Predict the structure of Dihydrofolate reductase.
Amino acid sequence: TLSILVAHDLQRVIGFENQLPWHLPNDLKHVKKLSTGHTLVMGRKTFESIGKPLPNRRNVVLTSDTSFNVEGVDVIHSIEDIYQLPGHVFIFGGQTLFEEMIDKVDDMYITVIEGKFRGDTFFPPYTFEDWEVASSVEGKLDEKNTIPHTFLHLIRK
Ligand SMILES: NC(=O)c1ccc[n+]([C@@H]2O[C@H](COP(=O)([O-])OP(=O)(O)OC[C@H]3O[C@@H](n4cnc5c(N)ncnc54)[C@H](OP(=O)(O)O)[C@@H]3O)[C@@H](O)[C@H]2O)c1
Ligand SMILES: COc1cc2nc(-c3nccs3)n(-c3ccc4c(N)nc(N)nc4c3)c2cc1OC
């Protein structure tokens, strides 16, 4: 299976200055649970933003940099390389990767951040005419998670 994982706000903002615009621990937990034991494919900028490979999953980084060789990370240099990766593959970001892969993925696990943030990077537009809502679950709010959010699982019709 080839899936997208993304958190985007009401206007599809996904990032600002190479970081998440919001602090939402529950989104990170959501992503951890979905991807543990599986594969993440991310662009070079997203990788450098996180700063280290995430434990207990395969970390694959897409970059044109032939000097890229980081411990605990596998490197690919083409979009086509993604299709040769076994198991459940998750497209992990960022904007460029999402734009390249939205037409290619089986499904999407979206965290809709129910707010309007300042962004410099965006998830591409999509329509529910193309995507079936497999599930929609309202995120629980507490002291550490104060922004309303909804976990959507969308499957291409
Ligand atoms: N909200 C979310 O779910 C989420 C998740 C992840 C990231 N983000 C955000 O997204 C933003 C980053 O997005 P971005 O588009 O600027 O960067 P990005 O997608 O993370 O990485 C872009 C880089 O990936 C490499 N790349 C992409 N396609 C390639 C291809 N076909 N062949 C070879 N290399 C390729 C290139 O690396 P080289 O220049 O090294 O060649 C390119 O510069 C940040 O703000 C981050 O916080 C948000
Ligand atoms: C150390 O723990 C984490 C740190 C993280 N930093 C990030 C950053 N995102 C953008 C810039 S940095 N995340 C990420 C990375 C990708 C995500 C995606 N595709 N989708 C969703 N929903 N959340 C993400 C969180 C992270 C996810 C993490 O745990 C899973």
The pocket of NAP (ligand 1) is lined by residues 6-7, 14-15, 18-20, 42-46, 49, 62-65, 77-79, 93-97, 100, 121 (CB under 6 Å). Strands lie at 2-9, 13-15, 39-43, 58-62, 74-76, 89-93, 107-113, 121-122, 131-138, 149-156. The chain has one domain: 1-157. Residues 68 and 75 are 7 Å apart (CA to CA).
